[PDB]
Paper text:
The periplasmic binding protein (PBP) CeuE1 is an important component of the Fe(III) uptake system in Campylobacter jejuni, a commensal Gram-negative bacterium in the avian gut, but a common source of food poisoning in humans. CeuE, an integral part of the CeuBCDE ABC transporter of C. jejuni, is responsible for capturing Fe(III)-siderophore complexes in the periplasm for delivery to their respective inner membrane transporter. C. jejuni does not itself synthesize siderophores, but capitalizes on their secretion by other bacteria, such as E. coli. Here we report a combined solution and structural study of a series of synthetic tetradentate analogues of the enterobactin-derived bis(2, 3-dihydroxybenzoyl-L-Ser), to explore the ligand-binding promiscuity of CeuE, both wild type and with mutations of the Fe(III) binding residues H227 and Y288.
To probe the relative contributions of His227 and Tyr288 to Fe(III)-siderophore binding, site-directed mutagenesis was then used to replace the side chains of the two Fe(III)-coordinating amino acids with non-coordinating side chains of similar size. His227 was mutated to either leucine (H227L) or alanine (H227A), while Y288 was mutated to phenylalanine (Y288F). All five mutants (Y288F, H227L, H227A, H227L/Y288F, H227A/Y288F) were crystallized in their apo form, and all structures are closely similar to that of wild type CeuE. However while there is clear electron density for the Y288F mutation in its three structures, H227L and H227A are located in a flexible loop region and there is generally no electron density to confirm their presence. Mutants H227L and H227A gave Kd values of 22 ± 10 nM and 35 ± 14 nM, respectively, indicating only slightly weaker binding than for wild type, which indicates that the tyrosinate O-donor binds the Fe(III) cation more strongly than the histidine N-donor. The Λ-configuration signal was observed for mutants H227L and H227A, indicating that these do indeed bind Λ-Fe-5-Lic. The Λ-configuration was observed for all four, but with a decrease in signal amplitude compared to wild type, confirming the reduced binding affinity observed in the fluorescence quenching experiments.
Residue numbers in the entry: 22 to 310
Amino acid sequence: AMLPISMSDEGDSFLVKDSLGENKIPKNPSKVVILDLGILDTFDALKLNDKVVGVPAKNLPKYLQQFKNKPSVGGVQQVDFEAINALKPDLIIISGRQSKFYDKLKEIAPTLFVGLDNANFLSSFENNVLSVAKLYGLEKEALEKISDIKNEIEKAKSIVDEDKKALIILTNSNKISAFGPQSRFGIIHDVLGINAVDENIKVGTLGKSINSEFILEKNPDYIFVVDRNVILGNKERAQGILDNALVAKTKAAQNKKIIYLDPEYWYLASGNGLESLKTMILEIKNAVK
Ligand SMILES: [Br-]
Ligand SMILES: [Br-]
Ligand SMILES: [Br-]
């Protein structure tokens, strides 16, 4: 299990420990740079917009356009260190994608890591949200919203068919990669309890390289697709890679249960957001109800 965030109250500040290191963070930080889209959506849900001074503005998704005019510190992949320094923040918040930049960021300002543990997603989510809330004295409000998520999970789980199985795939222009439980797409299986066609795909971010022959052999009831063609802006789309007589014979094709998930949620991994996680849960529930 990933080490959680822990915090001791030191009067005007908290001494914070997480899986990357230790930081003294001021109470009520007023100049926050946020590189994780999910936690950015949690700042909105907690009414903390005016604490935010820098976001990855370049390809910000549709549900975070209230932050489109914040100073930019980057994009999905790139970080602008010069901009982050000029903003003179009191806190920087990162997740997994930016852990490679930890030491450089920490030279600028205290740097809090809100990692999502693929083996323990809900426990990491709740830890992340409540840790941010503690900084602002907003635990009450954060617990209410976490309860709302919990209730939506239980509603979705209660409609899941015990005997049907799903496959998760990530498409590129000419490539199909499968993902299973305890992946970064794993909440389908791990949180909502939809069964997997293959519970033994090996852990790791590349997933398993597959073809249509594999899809037919597995014969999934549902296929959840995360089309990376969309985030890059290429012409080939998953519907095309899947448009063949092998895929067409599957239960999922026959029952129109090839589900094209919005990659602005699933590929950008906005699970830390109190509203974006709800949107994702509802996206699955409505695909399988
Ligand atoms: Br820390
Ligand atoms: Br505007
Ligand atoms: Br993964």
